[PDB]
Amino acid sequence: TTTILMLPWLGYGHLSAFLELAKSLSRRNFHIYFCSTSVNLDAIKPKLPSSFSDSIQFVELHLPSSPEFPPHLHTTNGLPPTLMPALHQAFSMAAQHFESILQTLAPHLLIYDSLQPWAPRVASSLKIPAINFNTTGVFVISQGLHPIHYPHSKFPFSEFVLHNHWKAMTERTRKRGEAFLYCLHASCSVILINSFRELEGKYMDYLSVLLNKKVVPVGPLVYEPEDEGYSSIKNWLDKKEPSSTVFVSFGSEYFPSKEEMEEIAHGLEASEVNFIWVVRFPQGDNTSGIEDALPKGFLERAGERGMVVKGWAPQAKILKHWSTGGFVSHCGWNSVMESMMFGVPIIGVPMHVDQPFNAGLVEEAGVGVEAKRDPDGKIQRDEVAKLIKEVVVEKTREDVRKKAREMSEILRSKGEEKFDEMVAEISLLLKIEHHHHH
Ligand SMILES: O=c1ccn([C@@H]2O[C@H](COP(=O)(O)OP(=O)(O)O)[C@@H](O)[C@H]2O)c(=O)[nH]1
């Protein structure tokens, strides 16, 4: 049996997408070693049905630990943002443990994420082929690589303009970029990406030219789950009108500022929509409460229309509920893919990293709308309220709703043939590499 070790970056969205890919590979008679920190493995274990217990094996990776950065913080999930550089550095320091794991397990292939250039380096030293799997979409990667080759030319095939807020948003950025570049360039023969041609084909073709490598889509990769946490939420949603409610979430690794929450809250209130909003506090803060993060009296004024959930909610179950008419989202790529799969239009409030590019692609495909920031880069309560009202409450953006339903139909028609290309490229790569090693 051909064995694959998978090494996601230490974020919940990365773990989730890698796990869905692991499931699809396991059904093609690959044996998977799924490698991450213990805190990440514990968070993802509930998402693996017992049907996979024999073919997907978890392997713990150990990072350097200290009382001030202990192992339960070795994840981006709820991590204080100021600890993000320490987490990247600690992950790079796991390379020797990673080498010993690869020596002991001797997998035939490594599939690695784009935040760990040390991983393909270790694999190559051990004569283990390594392929890069990207859990973002293609658009942001092609936008990042284009200036390296065409520094004086506008990006082709798109009218998207990045807001000055993010253009402004030095060596931390450069080294993360150069690490990302290495991960792409080091990949053996192909790169894998969680996207699909109907959405991003022209950008995959362009990225393939920029890299001189085949770009292989393996998307849509979307996780779909008796549940007590959803029960209370389900009971509330069951009393609402169809397509009347928005889910509001900024993902697993972002905490909007007090001012950002103010604009979102006032946008929700003015729109008169029903909403479920996930509000979170960073690890180590178990004093803070919902009431302090929100404007004074906001939940009192919202009354029956509003529900705030602390910490975490069953996002996929909520989006699939017939009451949900929209998704106010930071536009993390897994959230975008889920929203498209479930046919829910996106109201984009991107915050950082790849999100503004994802929101621009959402707008371009017409399956959602982006709440634009004002000249100074602030979220605008008026823009949030107007888009919720148009898309969900009054439903005057029927173009958006129809395109989102159309996209869902397309995505639901896809089957296991979406993995045919990846499996053939893996087979070829391993057969070429077997001759080399000989
Ligand atoms: O309260 C929450 C917040 C997030 N998610 C899931 O966490 C993942 C978030 O991934 P995404 O790429 O959207 O954003 P990130 O967390 O990486 O910024 C998605 O699968 C969401 O469905 C969830 O289930 N409940």
Coordinates of C-alpha atoms and ligand atoms in Angstrom, one line a residue:
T1 CA 0.0 0.0 0.0
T2 CA 1.3 3.5 -0.9
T3 CA 1.7 5.7 2.2
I4 CA 1.4 9.4 2.4
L5 CA 2.4 11.6 5.3
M6 CA 0.4 14.9 5.4
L7 CA 1.7 18.0 7.2
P8 CA -0.8 20.9 7.4
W9 CA 0.1 24.2 8.8
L10 CA -1.1 24.5 12.4
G11 CA -4.4 26.3 11.7
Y12 CA -7.8 24.8 12.0
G13 CA -8.8 25.7 8.4
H14 CA -5.6 24.1 7.1
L15 CA -6.1 21.0 9.3
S16 CA -9.7 20.7 8.0
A17 CA -8.9 20.9 4.3
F18 CA -5.9 18.5 4.7
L19 CA -8.2 16.0 6.5
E20 CA -10.8 16.2 3.8
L21 CA -8.1 15.5 1.2
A22 CA -6.8 12.6 3.4
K23 CA -10.3 11.1 3.4
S24 CA -10.4 11.2 -0.4
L25 CA -7.0 9.7 -0.7
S26 CA -7.8 6.9 1.8
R27 CA -10.7 5.8 -0.5
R28 CA -8.2 5.4 -3.3
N29 CA -6.2 2.8 -1.3
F30 CA -3.6 5.2 0.1
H31 CA -2.6 4.9 3.8
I32 CA -2.3 8.3 5.4
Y33 CA -0.2 9.5 8.3
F34 CA -1.7 12.7 9.4
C35 CA 0.8 14.8 11.3
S36 CA 0.2 17.8 13.6
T37 CA 0.5 19.0 17.2
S38 CA -1.5 17.3 19.8
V39 CA -3.8 20.2 20.4
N40 CA -4.6 20.3 16.7
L41 CA -5.1 16.5 16.4
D42 CA -7.6 16.6 19.3
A43 CA -9.6 19.4 17.6
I44 CA -9.8 17.5 14.3
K45 CA -10.4 13.9 15.6
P46 CA -14.2 14.4 16.0
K47 CA -14.3 15.1 12.2
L48 CA -13.0 11.7 11.3
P49 CA -15.6 9.0 11.0
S50 CA -14.7 5.5 12.4
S51 CA -14.8 4.2 8.8
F52 CA -11.4 5.8 8.3
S53 CA -9.8 4.5 11.6
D54 CA -7.6 1.9 9.7
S55 CA -6.4 4.1 6.8
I56 CA -5.8 7.5 8.4
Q57 CA -3.4 7.4 11.4
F58 CA -2.6 10.5 13.5
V59 CA 1.1 11.2 14.3
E60 CA 2.0 13.8 16.9
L61 CA 4.6 16.5 16.1
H62 CA 6.2 18.1 19.1
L63 CA 7.2 21.8 19.1
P64 CA 9.5 23.4 21.7
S65 CA 7.5 24.3 24.8
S66 CA 7.8 26.7 27.7
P67 CA 5.4 27.7 30.5
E68 CA 4.8 30.9 28.6
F69 CA 4.2 29.0 25.3
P70 CA 2.9 25.6 26.3
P71 CA 1.6 22.9 24.0
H72 CA -2.0 23.8 24.3
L73 CA -1.1 27.0 22.4
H74 CA 0.6 25.2 19.5
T75 CA -2.2 26.1 17.1
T76 CA -3.5 29.3 15.6
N77 CA -7.0 28.4 16.8
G78 CA -7.8 31.2 19.2
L79 CA -4.2 32.1 19.5
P80 CA -3.4 35.7 20.7
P81 CA -2.3 37.3 17.4
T82 CA 0.9 38.6 19.0
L83 CA 2.0 34.9 19.4
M84 CA 1.7 34.2 15.7
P85 CA 5.5 34.9 15.0
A86 CA 6.4 32.6 17.9
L87 CA 4.2 29.8 16.5
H88 CA 5.8 30.0 13.1
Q89 CA 9.3 29.9 14.7
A90 CA 8.4 27.0 17.0
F91 CA 7.0 25.1 14.0
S92 CA 10.3 25.6 12.1
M93 CA 12.1 24.2 15.2
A94 CA 10.1 20.9 14.9
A95 CA 12.0 20.0 11.8
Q96 CA 14.3 17.6 13.6
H97 CA 11.4 15.7 15.1
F98 CA 9.8 15.8 11.7
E99 CA 12.9 14.2 10.2
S100 CA 12.9 11.4 12.7
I101 CA 9.2 10.8 12.0
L102 CA 9.9 10.5 8.3
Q103 CA 12.8 8.2 9.0
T104 CA 10.7 5.9 11.2
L105 CA 7.5 5.8 9.0
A106 CA 9.3 6.0 5.6
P107 CA 6.2 7.3 3.7
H108 CA 6.3 7.2 -0.1
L109 CA 5.1 10.8 -0.4
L110 CA 4.9 13.9 1.7
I111 CA 2.0 16.4 1.1
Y112 CA 2.9 19.7 2.8
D113 CA 1.4 23.1 3.4
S114 CA 2.8 26.4 2.2
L115 CA 4.1 27.8 5.5
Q116 CA 6.9 25.3 6.1
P117 CA 9.8 25.4 3.6
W118 CA 11.8 23.1 6.0
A119 CA 9.4 20.3 5.3
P120 CA 10.2 19.6 1.6
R121 CA 13.9 20.2 2.5
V122 CA 13.8 17.4 5.0
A123 CA 11.8 15.1 2.7
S124 CA 14.3 15.7 -0.1
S125 CA 17.2 14.9 2.1
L126 CA 15.5 11.5 2.8
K127 CA 14.7 10.9 -0.9
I128 CA 10.9 11.2 -0.2
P129 CA 9.0 13.0 -2.9
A130 CA 7.0 16.0 -1.7
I131 CA 4.0 17.8 -3.1
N132 CA 2.6 21.2 -1.9
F133 CA -1.1 21.3 -1.1
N134 CA -2.6 24.8 -0.9
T135 CA -5.8 25.3 1.2
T136 CA -6.3 28.8 -0.2
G137 CA -7.8 29.5 -3.6
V138 CA -5.8 30.1 -6.7
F139 CA -6.5 33.8 -7.2
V140 CA -4.5 35.0 -4.2
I141 CA -1.5 32.8 -5.1
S142 CA -1.5 34.1 -8.7
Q143 CA -1.7 37.6 -7.4
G144 CA 1.3 37.0 -5.2
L145 CA 3.4 35.4 -7.9
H146 CA 2.5 37.8 -10.8
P147 CA 4.7 40.8 -9.6
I148 CA 7.7 38.5 -9.2
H149 CA 7.7 38.1 -13.0
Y150 CA 5.8 41.2 -14.1
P151 CA 6.6 43.9 -11.5
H152 CA 5.5 46.7 -13.8
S153 CA 2.3 45.3 -15.2
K154 CA -1.3 45.0 -14.0
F155 CA -2.5 41.5 -13.1
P156 CA -4.4 40.1 -16.1
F157 CA -8.0 38.9 -16.4
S158 CA -9.4 40.7 -13.4
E159 CA -10.7 44.2 -12.5
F160 CA -10.0 43.5 -8.8
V161 CA -8.2 46.3 -7.0
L162 CA -6.7 45.8 -3.6
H163 CA -7.8 48.5 -1.1
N164 CA -5.0 50.7 0.1
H165 CA -5.8 49.4 3.6
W166 CA -4.2 46.1 2.7
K167 CA -1.5 47.4 0.3
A168 CA -0.2 49.4 3.3
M169 CA -0.8 46.4 5.6
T170 CA 8.6 44.7 6.5
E171 CA 11.0 41.7 6.8
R172 CA 8.3 39.6 8.5
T173 CA 6.2 40.0 5.4
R174 CA 9.1 39.4 3.1
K175 CA 10.3 36.2 4.8
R176 CA 6.7 34.8 4.9
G177 CA 6.5 35.5 1.2
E178 CA 9.8 34.0 0.4
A179 CA 8.9 30.9 2.5
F180 CA 5.7 30.6 0.5
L181 CA 7.5 30.9 -2.8
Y182 CA 10.0 28.2 -1.8
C183 CA 7.1 25.8 -0.9
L184 CA 5.6 26.3 -4.3
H185 CA 8.9 26.1 -6.2
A186 CA 10.1 23.1 -4.3
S187 CA 6.9 21.0 -5.0
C188 CA 7.6 17.9 -7.1
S189 CA 6.0 18.2 -10.6
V190 CA 2.6 19.6 -9.5
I191 CA 0.9 21.7 -6.9
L192 CA -2.5 20.8 -5.4
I193 CA -5.1 23.5 -4.7
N194 CA -8.5 23.4 -3.0
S195 CA -10.3 25.1 -5.9
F196 CA -12.2 24.1 -9.1
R197 CA -12.1 25.2 -12.7
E198 CA -15.6 26.6 -13.0
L199 CA -14.5 29.2 -10.4
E200 CA -10.8 29.8 -11.0
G201 CA -9.7 28.0 -14.2
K202 CA -8.1 31.0 -15.9
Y203 CA -6.1 31.7 -12.8
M204 CA -4.9 28.1 -12.5
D205 CA -3.7 28.3 -16.1
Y206 CA -1.9 31.6 -15.4
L207 CA -0.4 30.2 -12.2
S208 CA 0.8 27.1 -14.1
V209 CA 2.7 29.4 -16.5
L210 CA 4.2 31.5 -13.7
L211 CA 5.4 28.3 -11.9
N212 CA 6.2 26.1 -15.0
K213 CA 4.4 23.4 -13.0
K214 CA 1.0 21.8 -13.4
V215 CA -1.7 23.3 -11.0
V216 CA -4.0 20.5 -10.0
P217 CA -7.4 21.4 -8.5
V218 CA -8.7 19.0 -5.9
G219 CA -11.7 21.0 -4.8
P220 CA -14.4 21.5 -3.6
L221 CA -13.1 20.1 -0.3
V222 CA -15.9 20.8 2.2
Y223 CA -16.5 19.1 5.5
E224 CA -20.1 18.1 6.2
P225 CA -21.1 16.5 9.6
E226 CA -27.6 13.8 17.4
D227 CA -25.8 17.0 18.5
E228 CA -26.6 19.0 21.7
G229 CA -24.7 22.2 20.9
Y230 CA -26.6 22.6 17.6
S231 CA -29.9 21.7 19.4
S232 CA -30.4 25.1 21.1
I233 CA -29.4 26.9 17.9
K234 CA -31.6 24.6 15.7
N235 CA -34.6 25.2 18.0
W236 CA -34.2 29.0 17.5
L237 CA -33.6 28.8 13.8
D238 CA -36.7 26.5 13.4
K239 CA -38.9 29.4 14.4
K240 CA -37.6 31.8 11.8
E241 CA -38.8 32.5 8.3
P242 CA -37.0 30.7 5.5
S243 CA -33.9 32.5 4.1
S244 CA -34.2 35.2 6.8
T245 CA -31.1 34.8 8.9
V246 CA -27.4 35.5 8.5
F247 CA -24.6 33.6 10.2
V248 CA -21.7 35.9 11.2
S249 CA -18.3 34.5 11.7
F250 CA -14.7 35.6 11.4
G251 CA -13.1 32.2 11.4
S252 CA -10.8 30.5 13.8
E253 CA -7.9 32.9 14.0
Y254 CA -9.1 36.4 13.9
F255 CA -10.5 38.7 16.7
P256 CA -12.1 41.8 15.3
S257 CA -11.3 45.0 17.3
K258 CA -13.8 46.8 19.4
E259 CA -14.3 49.4 16.6
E260 CA -14.8 46.6 14.0
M261 CA -17.4 44.9 16.2
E262 CA -19.2 48.2 16.6
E263 CA -19.6 48.7 12.9
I264 CA -20.7 45.0 12.3
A265 CA -23.1 45.2 15.2
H266 CA -24.6 48.5 14.0
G267 CA -24.8 47.1 10.5
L268 CA -26.7 44.1 11.8
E269 CA -29.1 46.2 13.9
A270 CA -29.9 48.7 11.1
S271 CA -30.5 45.8 8.6
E272 CA -33.3 44.3 10.8
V273 CA -32.1 40.8 9.8
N274 CA -32.1 37.8 12.1
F275 CA -28.5 36.8 13.0
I276 CA -26.4 34.2 14.8
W277 CA -23.0 35.7 15.5
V278 CA -20.0 33.8 16.8
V279 CA -18.0 36.0 19.2
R280 CA -14.7 34.7 20.5
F281 CA -11.9 35.6 22.9
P282 CA -8.2 34.6 22.6
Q283 CA -6.9 31.6 24.6
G284 CA -6.0 32.7 28.1
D285 CA -8.9 35.2 28.3
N286 CA -11.7 33.5 30.2
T287 CA -12.7 36.6 32.0
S288 CA -14.2 38.4 29.0
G289 CA -17.9 38.2 28.2
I290 CA -20.1 38.7 25.2
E291 CA -21.6 41.8 26.7
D292 CA -18.4 43.7 26.9
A293 CA -17.3 43.0 23.3
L294 CA -20.5 44.4 21.9
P295 CA -22.0 47.9 21.9
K296 CA -24.0 48.7 25.0
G297 CA -27.6 47.5 24.7
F298 CA -27.0 45.9 21.3
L299 CA -28.5 42.5 22.2
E300 CA -31.4 44.1 24.2
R301 CA -32.3 46.2 21.1
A302 CA -32.0 43.2 18.7
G303 CA -34.3 41.1 20.9
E304 CA -35.6 38.0 19.2
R305 CA -33.7 38.8 16.0
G306 CA -30.3 38.2 17.5
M307 CA -28.4 35.3 19.0
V308 CA -24.7 35.5 19.9
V309 CA -22.8 32.2 20.5
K310 CA -19.5 32.3 22.5
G311 CA -16.5 30.5 21.2
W312 CA -17.6 28.2 18.5
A313 CA -20.7 27.2 16.5
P314 CA -21.7 24.4 14.1
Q315 CA -21.1 26.5 11.0
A316 CA -21.9 23.9 8.4
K317 CA -25.1 22.8 10.1
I318 CA -26.2 26.5 10.4
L319 CA -25.4 27.3 6.8
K320 CA -27.4 24.3 5.6
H321 CA -30.5 25.2 7.7
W322 CA -33.4 26.5 5.6
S323 CA -33.6 29.7 7.7
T324 CA -30.2 30.9 6.6
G325 CA -30.3 33.4 3.8
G326 CA -26.8 34.8 4.0
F327 CA -23.3 34.5 5.5
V328 CA -21.5 37.6 6.9
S329 CA -18.0 36.2 6.6
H330 CA -14.3 37.1 6.9
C331 CA -14.0 35.2 3.6
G332 CA -11.6 32.5 4.8
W333 CA -11.4 30.1 2.0
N334 CA -13.0 27.1 3.7
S335 CA -15.9 29.4 4.7
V336 CA -16.2 30.5 1.0
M337 CA -16.2 27.0 -0.3
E338 CA -18.7 25.9 2.3
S339 CA -21.0 28.8 1.5
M340 CA -20.9 28.0 -2.2
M341 CA -21.5 24.3 -1.6
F342 CA -24.5 25.0 0.5
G343 CA -25.8 27.8 -1.8
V344 CA -25.6 30.6 0.8
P345 CA -24.7 34.1 -0.6
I346 CA -21.7 35.7 1.1
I347 CA -21.6 39.2 2.5
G348 CA -17.9 39.7 2.6
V349 CA -16.1 41.5 5.5
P350 CA -12.5 40.4 4.8
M351 CA -10.0 41.2 7.5
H352 CA -6.5 40.2 6.5
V353 CA -4.1 37.8 4.7
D354 CA -5.8 36.1 1.7
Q355 CA -9.3 37.3 2.7
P356 CA -9.5 40.5 0.6
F357 CA -8.5 38.6 -2.5
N358 CA -11.0 35.9 -1.7
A359 CA -13.8 38.5 -1.3
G360 CA -12.8 40.0 -4.6
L361 CA -13.1 36.6 -6.3
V362 CA -16.5 36.0 -4.6
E363 CA -17.7 39.4 -6.0
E364 CA -16.3 38.5 -9.4
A365 CA -18.0 35.1 -9.6
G366 CA -21.2 36.8 -8.4
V367 CA -22.0 34.4 -5.5
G368 CA -21.6 37.2 -3.0
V369 CA -21.0 40.9 -2.3
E370 CA -18.1 42.6 -0.5
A371 CA -18.8 45.3 2.0
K372 CA -16.2 47.9 0.9
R373 CA -14.1 49.7 3.5
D374 CA -14.1 53.5 3.6
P375 CA -11.1 55.6 2.4
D376 CA -9.4 55.3 5.8
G377 CA -9.8 51.5 5.7
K378 CA -12.6 51.2 8.3
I379 CA -15.6 48.9 8.1
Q380 CA -18.7 50.8 7.2
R381 CA -21.9 50.1 9.2
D382 CA -23.9 51.6 6.3
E383 CA -22.3 49.2 3.7
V384 CA -22.9 46.2 5.9
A385 CA -26.5 47.1 6.6
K386 CA -27.2 47.9 2.9
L387 CA -25.8 44.6 1.7
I388 CA -27.7 42.5 4.3
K389 CA -30.9 44.3 3.4
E390 CA -30.4 43.8 -0.3
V391 CA -29.3 40.2 -0.2
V392 CA -31.3 38.8 2.7
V393 CA -34.0 41.0 4.1
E394 CA -35.5 42.5 0.9
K395 CA -33.9 40.1 -1.5
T396 CA -33.4 42.7 -4.3
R397 CA -30.1 41.1 -5.2
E398 CA -31.7 38.1 -6.9
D399 CA -28.7 37.9 -9.3
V400 CA -26.5 37.0 -6.3
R401 CA -29.0 34.5 -4.8
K402 CA -29.5 32.7 -8.2
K403 CA -25.8 32.5 -8.9
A404 CA -25.1 31.1 -5.4
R405 CA -27.8 28.4 -6.0
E406 CA -26.3 27.7 -9.5
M407 CA -22.9 27.3 -8.0
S408 CA -24.2 24.9 -5.3
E409 CA -25.8 22.8 -8.1
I410 CA -22.4 22.6 -9.9
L411 CA -20.5 21.7 -6.8
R412 CA -23.1 19.1 -5.7
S413 CA -22.7 17.4 -9.1
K414 CA -19.0 16.7 -8.5
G415 CA -18.0 13.3 -7.4
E416 CA -14.8 11.3 -6.7
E417 CA -13.6 12.1 -10.3
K418 CA -12.5 15.4 -8.9
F419 CA -9.5 13.5 -7.5
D420 CA -8.6 11.6 -10.7
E421 CA -6.0 14.1 -11.8
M422 CA -4.2 14.3 -8.5
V423 CA -4.1 10.5 -8.2
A424 CA -2.6 10.1 -11.7
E425 CA 0.0 12.8 -11.0
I426 CA 1.0 11.1 -7.8
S427 CA 1.3 7.7 -9.5
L428 CA 3.5 9.2 -12.2
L429 CA 5.7 11.0 -9.7
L430 CA 6.2 8.0 -7.6
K431 CA 7.1 5.8 -10.6
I432 CA 9.6 8.4 -11.9
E433 CA 11.1 8.7 -8.4
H434 CA 11.4 5.0 -7.9
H435 CA 13.7 4.9 -10.9
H436 CA 15.8 7.7 -9.5
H437 CA 16.3 6.2 -6.1
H438 CA 17.5 2.9 -7.7
Ligands
LIG1 O1 -17.5 29.1 14.9 C1 -16.9 28.5 14.0 C2 -15.9 29.1 13.2 C3 -15.3 28.4 12.2 N1 -15.7 27.1 11.9 C4 -15.1 26.3 10.8 O2 -13.7 26.6 10.8 C5 -13.2 26.7 9.5 C6 -12.7 28.1 9.2 O3 -11.9 28.0 8.1 P1 -11.7 29.4 7.2 O4 -10.8 29.0 6.0 O5 -13.0 29.9 6.7 O6 -11.0 30.6 8.0 P2 -9.8 30.6 9.1 O7 -10.2 30.0 10.4 O8 -8.6 29.7 8.5 O9 -9.4 32.0 9.1 C7 -14.4 26.5 8.5 O10 -14.4 25.1 8.1 C8 -15.6 26.8 9.4 O11 -16.7 26.0 9.0 C9 -16.7 26.5 12.6 O12 -17.1 25.4 12.4 N2 -17.3 27.3 13.6

